[PDB]
Structure formats: structure tokens, C-alpha cells
Coordinates of N, CA, C and O in Angstrom, one line a residue:
Chain A
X1 N 73.2 86.1 93.0 CA 73.6 85.5 94.3 C 73.4 86.5 95.4 O 72.8 86.3 96.4
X2 N 74.0 87.7 95.2 CA 74.0 88.7 96.2 C 72.6 89.3 96.4 O 72.1 89.4 97.6
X3 N 71.8 89.5 95.3 CA 70.5 90.1 95.4 C 69.5 89.0 95.8 O 68.3 89.4 96.0
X4 N 69.8 87.8 95.8 CA 68.9 86.7 96.1 C 67.7 86.7 95.2 O 66.5 86.4 95.7
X5 N 67.9 87.0 94.0 CA 66.8 87.0 93.0 C 67.3 86.6 91.6 O 68.5 86.9 91.3
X6 N 66.5 85.9 90.9 CA 66.9 85.5 89.5 C 66.9 86.7 88.6 O 67.8 86.7 87.7
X7 N 66.0 87.7 88.8 CA 66.0 88.9 87.9 C 66.7 90.0 88.6 O 66.4 90.3 89.8
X8 N 67.5 90.8 87.9 CA 68.2 91.9 88.4 C 67.9 93.1 87.5 O 67.9 93.1 86.3
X9 N 67.6 94.3 88.2 CA 67.2 95.5 87.5 C 68.5 96.3 87.2 O 69.6 95.9 87.5
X10 N 68.3 97.4 86.4 CA 69.4 98.2 86.1 C 70.1 98.9 87.3 O 69.4 99.3 88.2
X11 N 71.4 98.9 87.3 CA 72.1 99.5 88.3 C 73.5 98.8 88.5 O 73.9 97.9 87.7
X12 N 74.2 99.3 89.5 CA 75.6 98.8 89.8 C 75.5 98.2 91.2 O 75.0 98.9 92.1
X13 N 76.1 97.1 91.4 CA 76.0 96.3 92.6 C 77.3 95.9 93.1 O 78.1 95.4 92.4
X14 N 77.6 96.1 94.4 CA 78.8 95.5 95.0 C 78.5 94.0 95.2 O 77.5 93.6 95.7
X15 N 79.5 93.2 94.8 CA 79.4 91.8 94.8 C 80.3 91.1 95.7 O 79.9 90.3 96.6
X16 N 81.6 91.3 95.5 CA 82.6 90.6 96.3 C 83.9 91.4 96.3 O 83.9 92.5 96.0
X17 N 85.0 90.7 96.7 CA 86.3 91.3 96.7 C 87.3 90.4 95.9 O 87.2 89.2 96.0
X18 N 88.1 91.0 95.1 CA 89.1 90.3 94.4 C 90.5 90.6 94.9 O 90.7 91.8 95.4
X19 N 91.4 89.7 94.8 CA 92.8 89.9 95.2 C 93.7 89.0 94.4 O 93.3 87.9 94.0
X20 N 95.0 89.4 94.2 CA 95.9 88.7 93.4 C 96.3 87.4 94.1 O 96.8 87.5 95.3
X21 N 96.2 86.3 93.5 CA 96.7 85.1 94.3 C 98.2 85.1 94.2 O 98.7 85.4 93.1
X22 N 98.9 84.7 95.2 CA 100.3 84.5 95.1 C 100.8 83.5 94.1 O 100.2 82.5 94.0
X23 N 101.8 83.9 93.3 CA 102.2 83.0 92.3 C 103.0 81.8 92.8 O 102.8 80.7 92.3
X24 N 103.8 82.0 93.9 CA 104.6 80.9 94.4 C 105.1 81.4 95.8 O 104.6 82.3 96.4
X25 N 106.0 80.6 96.4 CA 106.5 80.9 97.7 C 108.0 80.9 97.8 O 108.7 80.2 97.1
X26 N 108.5 81.8 98.7 CA 109.9 81.9 98.9 C 110.2 81.7 100.4 O 109.4 82.2 101.3
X27 N 111.2 80.9 100.7 CA 111.7 80.7 102.1 C 113.1 81.2 102.2 O 114.0 80.6 101.5
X28 N 113.4 82.1 103.1 CA 114.8 82.6 103.3 C 115.1 82.3 104.8 O 114.6 82.9 105.7
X29 N 116.0 81.3 105.0 CA 116.4 81.0 106.4 C 117.9 81.2 106.5 O 118.7 81.1 105.5
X30 N 118.4 81.4 107.7 CA 119.9 81.5 107.9 C 120.6 80.2 107.5 O 120.2 79.1 107.8
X31 N 121.7 80.5 106.8 CA 122.6 79.5 106.2 C 123.8 79.3 107.0 O 124.9 79.8 106.8
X32 N 123.6 78.5 108.1 CA 124.7 77.9 108.9 C 124.6 76.4 108.8 O 123.5 75.8 109.0
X33 N 125.7 75.8 108.4 CA 125.7 74.3 108.1 C 125.9 73.4 109.3 O 125.7 72.2 109.2
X34 N 126.4 74.0 110.4 CA 126.8 73.2 111.5 C 125.6 72.5 112.2 O 124.6 73.2 112.6
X35 N 125.6 71.2 112.3 CA 124.5 70.5 113.0 C 124.6 70.8 114.4 O 125.6 70.9 115.1
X36 N 123.4 71.1 115.0 CA 123.3 71.7 116.3 C 123.4 70.5 117.3 O 122.5 69.6 117.3
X37 N 124.4 70.5 118.2 CA 124.7 69.4 119.0 C 123.6 69.1 120.1 O 124.0 69.0 121.3
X38 N 122.4 68.9 119.7 CA 121.4 68.3 120.6 C 121.8 66.9 121.0 O 121.8 66.6 122.2
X39 N 122.2 66.1 120.1 CA 122.6 64.8 120.3 C 123.7 64.7 121.5 O 123.6 63.8 122.3
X40 N 124.6 65.6 121.5 CA 125.6 65.6 122.6 C 125.0 65.7 123.9 O 125.5 65.2 124.9
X41 N 123.9 66.5 124.0 CA 123.2 66.6 125.3 C 122.5 65.3 125.8 O 122.8 64.8 126.9
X42 N 121.7 64.8 124.9 CA 121.0 63.6 125.3 C 121.9 62.4 125.4 O 121.9 61.6 126.4
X43 N 122.8 62.2 124.4 CA 123.7 61.1 124.4 C 124.9 61.5 125.3 O 125.8 62.2 124.8
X44 N 124.9 61.0 126.5 CA 126.0 61.3 127.4 C 126.0 60.3 128.5 O 125.2 59.3 128.6
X45 N 126.9 60.5 129.5 CA 127.0 59.6 130.7 C 126.0 60.1 131.7 O 125.0 60.9 131.3
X46 N 126.1 59.7 132.9 CA 125.2 60.2 134.0 C 124.9 61.7 133.9 O 125.9 62.5 133.9
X47 N 123.7 62.0 133.9 CA 123.3 63.4 133.8 C 123.6 64.1 135.1 O 123.9 63.5 136.1
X48 N 123.5 65.4 135.1 CA 123.7 66.2 136.3 C 122.6 65.9 137.3 O 121.5 65.6 136.9
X49 N 123.0 65.9 138.6 CA 122.1 65.5 139.6 C 120.9 66.5 139.7 O 120.9 67.6 139.1
Chain B
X1 N 95.3 85.6 106.2 CA 95.5 84.3 106.8 C 94.4 83.4 106.3 O 93.2 83.7 106.5
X2 N 94.8 82.3 105.5 CA 93.7 81.5 105.0 C 92.9 80.8 106.0 O 91.7 80.7 105.9
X3 N 93.6 80.3 107.1 CA 92.9 79.7 108.2 C 91.9 80.7 108.8 O 90.7 80.3 109.1
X4 N 92.3 81.9 109.0 CA 91.4 82.9 109.6 C 90.2 83.2 108.6 O 89.1 83.4 109.1
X5 N 90.5 83.1 107.3 CA 89.4 83.3 106.4 C 88.4 82.2 106.5 O 87.2 82.5 106.4
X6 N 88.8 81.0 106.8 CA 87.8 79.9 107.0 C 87.0 80.2 108.3 O 85.8 80.0 108.3
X7 N 87.7 80.7 109.3 CA 87.0 81.0 110.6 C 85.9 82.1 110.4 O 84.9 82.1 111.0
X8 N 86.2 83.1 109.5 CA 85.3 84.2 109.4 C 84.0 83.8 108.8 O 82.9 84.3 109.2
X9 N 84.0 82.8 107.9 CA 82.7 82.3 107.3 C 81.8 81.7 108.4 O 80.6 81.8 108.3
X10 N 82.5 81.1 109.4 CA 81.7 80.5 110.5 C 80.9 81.5 111.3 O 79.8 81.3 111.7
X11 N 81.5 82.7 111.5 CA 80.9 83.7 112.4 C 79.6 84.2 111.8 O 78.7 84.5 112.6
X12 N 79.5 84.3 110.5 CA 78.2 84.6 109.9 C 78.5 85.6 108.7 O 79.6 85.7 108.2
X13 N 77.4 86.3 108.3 CA 77.4 87.2 107.2 C 77.4 88.6 107.7 O 76.8 89.5 107.1
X14 N 78.2 88.9 108.8 CA 78.3 90.2 109.3 C 78.8 91.2 108.3 O 78.5 92.4 108.3
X15 N 79.7 90.7 107.4 CA 80.3 91.6 106.4 C 79.3 92.2 105.5 O 79.3 93.4 105.1
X16 N 78.3 91.3 105.0 CA 77.3 91.8 104.1 C 76.5 92.9 104.7 O 76.1 93.8 104.0
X17 N 76.2 92.9 106.0 CA 75.5 94.0 106.6 C 76.3 95.3 106.5 O 75.8 96.4 106.2
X18 N 77.6 95.2 106.8 CA 78.5 96.4 106.7 C 78.5 96.9 105.3 O 78.4 98.2 105.1
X19 N 78.7 96.1 104.3 CA 78.7 96.5 102.9 C 77.4 97.2 102.5 O 77.5 98.2 101.8
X20 N 76.3 96.7 102.9 CA 75.0 97.3 102.7 C 75.0 98.7 103.4 O 74.5 99.7 102.8
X21 N 75.3 98.7 104.6 CA 75.2 100.0 105.4 C 76.2 101.0 104.8 O 75.8 102.2 104.6
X22 N 77.4 100.7 104.5 CA 78.4 101.7 104.0 C 78.0 102.1 102.6 O 78.2 103.3 102.3
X23 N 77.4 101.2 101.8 CA 77.0 101.6 100.5 C 75.9 102.7 100.5 O 76.0 103.6 99.7
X24 N 75.0 102.5 101.4 CA 73.9 103.5 101.5 C 74.5 104.9 101.9 O 74.0 105.9 101.4
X25 N 75.5 104.9 102.7 CA 76.1 106.2 103.1 C 76.8 106.8 101.8 O 76.7 108.0 101.5
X26 N 77.5 105.9 101.1 CA 78.2 106.4 99.9 C 77.3 107.0 98.9 O 77.6 108.0 98.2
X27 N 76.2 106.3 98.6 CA 75.2 106.8 97.7 C 74.6 108.1 98.1 O 74.5 109.0 97.3
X28 N 74.3 108.2 99.4 CA 73.7 109.5 99.9 C 74.7 110.6 99.8 O 74.2 111.8 99.5
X29 N 76.0 110.4 99.9 CA 76.9 111.5 99.7 C 76.8 112.1 98.3 O 76.8 113.3 98.2
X30 N 76.8 111.2 97.3 CA 76.6 111.7 96.0 C 75.3 112.4 95.8 O 75.1 113.4 95.1
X31 N 74.2 111.9 96.5 CA 72.9 112.5 96.4 C 72.9 113.9 97.0 O 72.3 114.9 96.5
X32 N 73.6 114.1 98.2 CA 73.7 115.3 98.8 C 74.3 116.4 97.9 O 73.7 117.5 97.9
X33 N 75.4 116.1 97.3 CA 75.9 117.1 96.3 C 75.0 117.4 95.2 O 75.0 118.5 94.7
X34 N 74.2 116.4 94.8 CA 73.3 116.6 93.7 C 72.2 117.6 94.0 O 71.9 118.5 93.2
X35 N 71.6 117.5 95.2 CA 70.5 118.4 95.6 C 71.0 119.8 95.7 O 70.3 120.8 95.4
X36 N 72.2 120.0 96.2 CA 72.7 121.3 96.5 C 73.3 122.0 95.2 O 72.9 123.1 94.9
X37 N 74.1 121.3 94.5 CA 74.9 121.9 93.4 C 74.2 121.7 92.0 O 74.7 122.3 91.1
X38 N 73.2 120.9 91.9 CA 72.5 120.7 90.7 C 71.0 121.2 90.8 O 70.2 120.3 91.1
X39 N 70.8 122.4 90.6 CA 69.4 123.0 90.6 C 69.2 123.8 89.4 O 68.1 124.5 89.4
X40 N 70.0 123.8 88.4 CA 69.8 124.5 87.2 C 69.8 123.5 86.1 O 70.6 122.6 86.0
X41 N 68.8 123.7 85.2 CA 68.6 122.7 84.1 C 69.6 122.9 83.0 O 70.1 122.0 82.4
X42 N 70.0 124.2 82.8 CA 70.9 124.5 81.7 C 72.1 125.3 82.2 O 72.0 126.2 83.1
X43 N 73.3 124.9 81.7 CA 74.5 125.6 82.1 C 74.5 127.0 81.5 O 74.3 127.1 80.2
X44 N 74.8 128.0 82.3 CA 74.8 129.4 81.8 C 76.3 129.9 81.8 O 77.0 129.7 82.8
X45 N 76.7 130.5 80.7 CA 78.0 131.1 80.6 C 77.9 132.6 80.6 O 77.0 133.1 79.9
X46 N 78.8 133.2 81.3 CA 78.8 134.7 81.4 C 79.1 135.3 80.0 O 79.8 134.7 79.2
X47 N 78.6 136.5 79.8 CA 78.9 137.2 78.5 C 80.4 137.5 78.5 O 81.0 137.7 79.5
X48 N 80.9 137.6 77.3 CA 82.4 138.0 77.2 C 82.7 139.3 77.8 O 83.7 139.5 78.4
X49 N 81.8 140.3 77.6 CA 82.0 141.6 78.2 C 81.6 141.5 79.7 O 80.5 141.1 80.1

């Protein structure tokens, strides 16, 4: 593929790059259980002028 | 970045040019040492005395 030829002569050739694929994924987020009172802002009486 | 990896393929084969260019330099470095330090056919060892 790299040499663009079916026949390849003796030698050593750079071909591509290899890397370890990640096994899995980890997510670490802050652990605060309080629901954030967005609802209190929208659900209200007459808004500020 | 996987998305960036997708974008890189679009730009072209610029990497292959660099790999070819850098490889030629690397080969020449080994050749330079060969011409200077390898000019004797047989290794000579000094006499014990």
C-alpha cells in the first residue's frame, strides 16, 4: 500500500503508526445530590421589571 | 481527538511527505557515520606489549 507496488524489494519501510486503544471510559463528576433550583426561577409570579 | 483525526484525512497526504523527508535525513545520518568511522576492512588490536 505505502510503496504503491505489488512487488517489494529487500529493506525496512515505515508504514503507519500504532497506539493502544482505550479499554473503557471513566467519568468522575462532583457528587452533590441537591437538584439545582432552575425551576424556582422560571416557575414564579410576575418577573422583575 | 477522533473528530480531528477525521478532519486530518480531508486535508491530504501531507504526513506522508514528512515521513519520507524525515526518513531520508535519518538514513543519511547513519550513512555519514559509516563513511567517516568505517574505512578499515579488518579490526586491528594493539599488541599486548
